[PDB]
Amino acid sequence: NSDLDVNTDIYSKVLVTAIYLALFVVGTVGNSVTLFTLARLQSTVDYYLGSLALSDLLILLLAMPVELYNFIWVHHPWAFGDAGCRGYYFLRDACTYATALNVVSLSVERYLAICHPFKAKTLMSRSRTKKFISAIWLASALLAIPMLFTMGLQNLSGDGTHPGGLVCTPIVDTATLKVVIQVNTFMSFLFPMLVASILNTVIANKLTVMVHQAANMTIEPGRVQALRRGVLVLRAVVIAFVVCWLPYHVRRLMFCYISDEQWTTFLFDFYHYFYMLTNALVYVSAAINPILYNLVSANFRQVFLSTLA
């Protein structure tokens, strides 16, 4: 009787959920220790770091255990309820918007702090910066209220009455769904993508023409060598952002762009396995934003093993 149950076998399922659980534990412990560390002068970048860390901690701890509890093992008869599903996708879309806007404004603060630094001394202040943190949180909530305006419950049994056939799906029509998730992918992926990539290439270009041309001794090429390690910590953040938040948004828009005429059974199976892959990559990003901020800089490595042990 339970139709619309996909036959996903248990070996790949337990491999994916083991990847998920390892990702979750290392990501929540990393975001916990970096949030407590930044909770432990021009300190206008620590707020962006802590805000992105809190956004990653929030998306992990709110989506991921509920995600394994009612998305990979327990299929279409769910157990979280109407307010549960609507608030769950509200928090998911809000955390995605918050992580995207955190990448935007962190890259903007870096660009003002290097390529126009006197305008950062004039413009950027700790008070304003806290105002911008509250502003991007309120922008995430205001852009996630259409996720409250688009979600719902829908029975898709043989007569639409069975309590083992109701799913929690976008209940709006295909066109308005297209529009909301297309502006979702457009803003919350592409404008972060071009903004973070353009400003990080300009910052890396300014650093490379500051250490190569040098307008003096480079200091036996030691501090500028770790400045090229800073080029690595720039480029690694931007490539991690694009390579993690690209396929999730491609999967959202391939859910929008197909209207059952291009779906087959194998493409249904491939869509569900690709959904496990893209949410694996989202939890990858949620784990390796604090891991990228921790491991590649040895001072963070020492102080966080001092926090751990």
Partner: peptide
């Protein structure tokens, strides 16, 4: 046969 999970 359209997927429902987003």
């Amino acid at each position: 046969r359209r997927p429902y999970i987003l």
